[PDB]
Structures are given as structure tokens and as C-alpha cells.
């Protein structure tokens, strides 16, 4: 037909905006990112595509990130357009605390930060972001939380998701063995299994990965953005008997 | 404080007293008050100083490109640049100055500029808060079409006539010259005109 593909404000006769859906296949090129919601602490996870030998894949976390001492993110999409809206998020959370003097809830910035990704699928000769996220938080109103944001602006709250490549199985494998209690250390041993069983390679090293953890587990209650280093995933990794 | 300029047959002359003041303290006693705005254009900075520096340093910008784009300038053109900065911004600053130049065709010219901003034609011109003591001791000694030797001391006898009786602001004296051939800074010292 007369091809309705060239601007994100064109509305094909069937009612569907094509140039948004394209973004939702610009994400499959990405690198997988997983998060499971425990009963006593969320876990996240990740996986990288490029892993040549002569580049420092030790300290540089490229996907996992923080927003403050309560909230963490795991990206899946273009990387030019992650700094743009993860500094903005930091700059949003502080500028809430700064003027209500209490911590940011998750359902605010996910609500906000997704409307930003809708302010570009509507007006101007602009593009929509190729981005997704996996939020992981805590707050008095609901406690533990998990959330997700497409490159459209639509968000939904979940219990366990994978984004990026090969989620099809990685949901399927997940949803048929996710118990509902799942103590934290019993969650990690699930997340690796998904990435172990879904990927393309067979090595699943210590360098290709990073997986972090939120923890309320301390006495004198408070939150702990525990990120894991290369030296202890190895303990996670030998312990399973890969 | 005490500056003046005069024309003659083969060119013109500028002059001044190298002294300043804030309150009643000798701060800088060797100051020049003459500006290389262009090769054969000069001036005399009377009034404030923070203003005339920047003003003069602008006018290079408009006379350094007008030099380039459109030809060598004329002296009439200069004061009609100075005038447009001093009139249009009169109610902030404090400056009243003099110019001088020369063409091989049109002989020496000297204009003047008060505080409020108004060019005028003049053969002899004076300016300075402490140089109103001379309007008598020059209008009688002065004539036209004289020469270098006759007008140099003419200046010299004037400025000491200022500083001796109640000048209240002046030091050494210096002067320059703008003929058709070239230019040369002159210098005369206290011991010369003091005993005079």
C-alpha cells in the first residue's frame, strides 16, 4: 500500500503506528536482563554480547546502574539513549526528596520517566527511545517492587521478567519453575539457569555477566544496594556445578 | 587635567601633562595620555580614564577595518565615531577629548569633544579640569601658519603657565607631532620649565 512508515505521527488506516513497533524490535538486538522478586529481597541479572579478551570487562558495568540507595536499573536497548534518561531520573528523584524531604517511590518516576518516552512518540520530528528497564525498589506503601517500561511509554508491574533477546523461552523456563516463596539465594540459582539455558554460547563466564541484589536483610532496618563483583559470582558459579 | 592641541603650517601638535590624581595623592606621575588610534590620528584623554581607554580601544576596531574594507580614513570620520559613543552613552561616563590628523591634500585638522558629546572645529583647543587658566594666556599669543619652533615653546610657556599659577594637577610635559613626513614623540622635563 501507500507506505505509512516514515513518521511516528501517521496513523495507518487500521489505527496502528508503525514506527513505534519498530523500536520494539530494536530491543531484541540487546543483551538479556532479568529480575526475580523474592519474598525477602529482589535479584537482578544481565548478560553481555561482546566479550573479546583485551578489554576491561572487570569494573565497567554498562547495564546495571543505580538511581539512589533504594532503586536500581538494568537496561536493554541503545546505549546513546540511556545516559540521557538515567541522569534525568537521578535528577528527578533528588528534586523530589529536596522538596518533600522523603525518599522517592518507584511508581512516581516510572510513571514520569515513561511519559517522557511518550512525549516523543507524539510530537515533532523526533524519535522514540530504544530503551527498556527493569526497576527494583522498596517503599513504605508496598515494600518490595518490580516494574518495567517499554520504548513506548507503557509500564507494568511484575514478579519476574526477562527483557532483551530470547525472553520467549526465558519466560517459559521461568514461569514453570518459579515458586512463590523463593528465598533470595534460591532466586539467583534460578536466574543463572535461565541465562545458562537461553543464551547462544556455552561458556557463561564470569566476565560476560553481572548480577546485583537488593537486600533489606540487615537488622536495624535499612536498604542495601548490593552489587556483586567478579570474584563472588565465581562462588555462585562453581556452586551450581555448571 | 591639562592637555591641548594646535595646528600649524607643516602639520599639527598635541601635548599633555603626565600626571593623574585620586583624591589628592600622586599615584602615577609618568602617564601618557595620547593614543595610537591610527598611524596619523591621535587624541588626548581628558575626563575620566576607565572610559577613555575603552572608548579609544574600540575606535581602533572601527578604524582598523575601515582601513581595510573601504580605504584609508579621514579625520572628520574620527570624531564622528567618538561622538556617537559619547552622545549615545553620555549619562553613564565622563570623557572629553581631542583629536588630530593630517592629509597631504587637506592640511592639519583639530576637533574637540566635550562631556555631553558635540564635535567642534578649532585650530587651538584645550581641555582639563585644571586647564581653564590659559584662555587668556593663549588667545593673545596665538596666530596661524607658524612653524615647529614657534609653536613648541608656545605650548611650553602655556602648560607651565597652568601648573605654576594654580594648575593643581600636572607633572612632566610631553608632546608629539604629525607632519606629512613622519612623527616623533618629544619630551621636556621639570628642570627646564620650572626655572622658566
Amino acid at each position: 500500500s501507500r507506505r505509512y512508515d516514515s513518521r511516528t505521527t501517521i496513523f495507518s488506516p487500521e489505527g496502528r503506528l508503525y514506527q513505534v513497533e519498530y523500536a520494539l524490535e530494536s530491543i531484541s538486538h540487546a543483551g538479556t536482563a532479568i529480575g526475580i522478586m523474592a519474598s525477602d529481597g529482589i535479584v537482578l541479572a544481565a548478560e553481555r554480547k561482546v566479550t573479546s579478551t583485551l578489554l576491561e570487562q572487570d569494573t565497567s558495568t554498562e547495564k546495571l546502574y543505580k538511581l539512589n540507595d533504594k532503586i536500581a536499573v538494568a537496561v536493554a536497548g541503545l546505549t546513546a539513549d540511556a545516559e540521557i534518561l538515567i541522569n534525568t531520573a537521578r535528577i528527578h528523584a533528588q528534586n523530589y526528596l529536596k522538596t518533600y524531604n522523603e525518599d522517592i517511590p518507584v511508581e512516581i518516576l516510572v510513571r514520569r520517566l515513561s511519559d517522557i518516552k511518550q512525549g516523543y512518540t507524539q510530537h515533532g520530528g523526533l524519535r522514540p527511545f530504544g530503551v527498556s528497564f527493569i526497576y527494583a525498589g522498596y517503599d513504605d506503601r508496598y515494600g518490595y517492587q518490580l516494574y518495567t517500561s517499554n520504548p513506548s511509554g507503557n509500564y507494568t508491574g511484575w514478579k519476574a521478567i526477562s527483557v532483551g533477546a530470547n525472553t520467549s523461552a526465558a519466560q517459559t523456563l521461568l514461569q514453570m519453575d518459579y515458586k512463590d516463596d523463593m528465598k533470595v539465594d534460591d532466586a539467583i540459582e534460578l536466574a543463572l539457569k535461565t541465562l545458562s539455558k537461553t543464551t547462544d554460547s556455552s561458556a557463561l563466564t564470569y566476565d560476560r555477566l553481572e548480577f546485583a541484589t537488593i537486600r533489606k536483610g540487615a537488622n536495624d532496618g535499612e536498604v542495601y544496594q548490593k552489587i556483586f563483583k567478579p570474584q563472588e559470582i565465581k562462588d555462585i558459579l562453581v556452586k551450581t556445578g555448571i | 587635567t591639562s592637555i591641548m592641541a594646535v595646528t600649524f603650517k607643516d602639520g599639527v601638535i598635541l601635548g599633555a601633562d603626565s600626571r593623574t590624581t585620586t583624591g589628592a595623592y600622586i599615584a602615577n606621575r609618568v602617564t601618557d595620555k595620547l593614543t595610537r588610534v591610527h598611524d596619523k590620528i591621535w587624541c588626548c584623554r581628558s575626563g575620566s580614564a576607565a572610559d577613555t581607554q575603552a572608548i579609544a580601544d574600540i575606535v581602533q576596531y572601527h578604524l582598523e577595518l575601515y582601513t581595510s574594507q573601504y580605504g584609508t580614513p579621514s579625520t572628520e570620520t574620527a570624531a564622528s565615531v567618538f561622538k556617537e559613543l559619547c552622545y549615545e552613552n553620555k549619562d553613564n561616563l565622563t570623557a572629553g577629548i581631542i583629536v588630530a590628523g593630517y592629509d597631504d591634500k587637506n592640511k592639519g585638522e583639530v576637533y574637540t569633544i566635550p562631556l555631553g558629546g558635540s564635535v567642534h572645529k578649532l585650530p587651538y583647543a584645550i581641555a582639563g579640569s585644571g586647564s581653564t587658566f590659559i584662555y587668556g594666556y593663549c588667545d593673545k599669543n596665538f596666530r596661524e601658519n607658524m612653524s615647529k619652533e614657534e609653536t613648541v615653546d608656545f605650548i611650553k610657556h602655556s602648560l607651565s603657565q597652568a601648573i605654576k599659577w594654580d594648575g593643581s594637577s600636572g607633572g612632566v610635559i610631553r608632546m608629539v607631532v604629525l607632519t606629512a613626513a613622519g612623527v616623533e614623540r618629544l619630551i621636556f622635563y621639570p628642570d627646564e620649565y620650572e626655572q622658566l
Partner: protein, 204 residues
């Protein structure tokens, strides 16, 4: 009336052998009155500490904006703030407002976690970085404390030996000041631990 001479607060800083000491007063109120026994005029960001004087709005408002920042510089550079940058930041973060300014006598104190060193400084309301090594003060009663702190502080001091010369420098002065002194507070700092003590004095 001056802004600086309204509410009332006094702060002190002092160097020591691998230890420092900072303190402040708790009185607050209008002109010729007092309302609260309890207003911690002193704060901390990371290991680096800070203390403020003068008008209370520009106390409470400088806490937030500096807290808006160091929680970025940690996220962005993956490293806490150390003082000798912080002491520059407070200059240029005040010298932007050279006109319509804030009305503060700040201080700063902390250790540089690389060389184990101590550090303090003081400022004015448009960012003149004073880098005295022995001590530095600010408040309404500065002139009532540069004297009764000079004669009391030797160099190369020990923490509790350095403690009791803050308080007496802090008490015998604030007891003479006209607009201060309902209870105090002090911090002694070492490379790897901190403790808070209050102090006893008069009341109304």
C-alpha cells in the same frame, strides 16, 4: 537589621593529631527571643562534615542543595566526595550569587581518605577560601572566640585532650554571647569512626 545578626549560631573547627573536632550551638529564634532548644546547625555529607551559621533559611537551604549534589557525584564517579574539592565547590556554588547573595559563615571539616590527613576550612558569603590549619570559626560571636581559642590550642593534640579545649572554648564564649547558648553538641572524628557528645549549660 543585618541578616547575619538575627537568629544566632556559633561553630568551631580545630585540627589535631589524626583527629579533628567540630561543634555548634542549638539556640534559634527571632530578634530578642528564643524558640527551640534543638536545631542541629551542623551536618554531614559522606565522611566530610560541614557547619553553617547565620540566617536559618540559608542554613536549611544550603543543606538540601549540597545534598542534591554529592548524591550525584557519588553515583556519577563511583567515589565519595573528599573535602579539598568540596571546599572549592562551596565557593563557586556561592559566587554565582554575588548579587542577591546568601548570608552565611560556613565551615568544613573532614579527613582525606587517601593520605589519612585531616582538613578544615572557613569561608565568607561570596567564597573566600580561608585555609587555616589550627582552627577556624564563624557565627555572631567570632570576636568573642578568636581570643579564647588562640591561647588554648597548642599544635599536635590528642582527641580527648583536644575535646575538652573545644567545649571550654565553646562554653565560656557562648555564655558571654548575647544571642546563643541553649545546649551544644560536638563531634570528634578519626580516620574510621565518629562519636557524638552533647554538653551541659544553662537554659530558659
Amino acid at each position: 537589621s543585618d541578616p547575619s545578626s538575627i537568629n544566632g549560631g556559633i561553630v568551631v573547627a580545630m585540627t589535631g593529631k589524626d583527629c579533628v573536632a567540630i561543634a555548634c550551638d542549638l539556640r534559634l529564634g527571632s530578634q530578642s527571643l528564643g524558640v527551640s532548644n534543638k536545631f542541629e546547625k551542623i551536618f554531614h555529607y559522606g565522611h566530610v562534615f560541614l557547619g553553617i551559621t547565620g540566617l536559618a533559611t540559608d542554613v536549611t537551604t544550603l543543606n538540601e542543595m549540597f545534598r542534591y549534589k554529592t548524591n550525584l557525584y557519588k553515583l556519577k564517579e563511583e567515589r565519595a566526595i573528599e573535602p579539598e574539592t568540596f571546599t572549592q565547590l562551596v565557593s563557586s556554588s556561592l559566587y554565582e550569587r554575588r548579587f542577591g547573595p546568601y548570608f552565611v559563615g560556613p565551615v568544613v571539616a573532614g579527613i582525606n581518605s587517601k593520605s589519612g590527613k585531616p582538613f578544615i576550612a572557613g569561608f565568607d558569603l561570596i567564597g573566600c577560601i580561608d585555609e587555616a590549619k589550627d582552627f577556624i570559626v564563624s557565627g555572631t560571636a567570632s570576636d568573642q572566640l578568636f581570643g579564647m581559642c588562640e591561647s588554648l590550642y597548642e599544635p599536635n593534640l590528642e582527641p580527648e585532650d583536644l575535646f575538652e579545649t573545644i567545649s571550654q572554648a565553646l562554653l565560656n564564649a557562648a555564655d558571654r554571647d548575647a544571642l546563643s547558648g541553649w545546649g551544644a553538641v560536638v563531634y570528634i572524628i578519626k580516620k574510621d569512626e565518629v562519636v557524638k557528645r552533647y554538653l551541659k549549660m544553662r537554659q530558659d
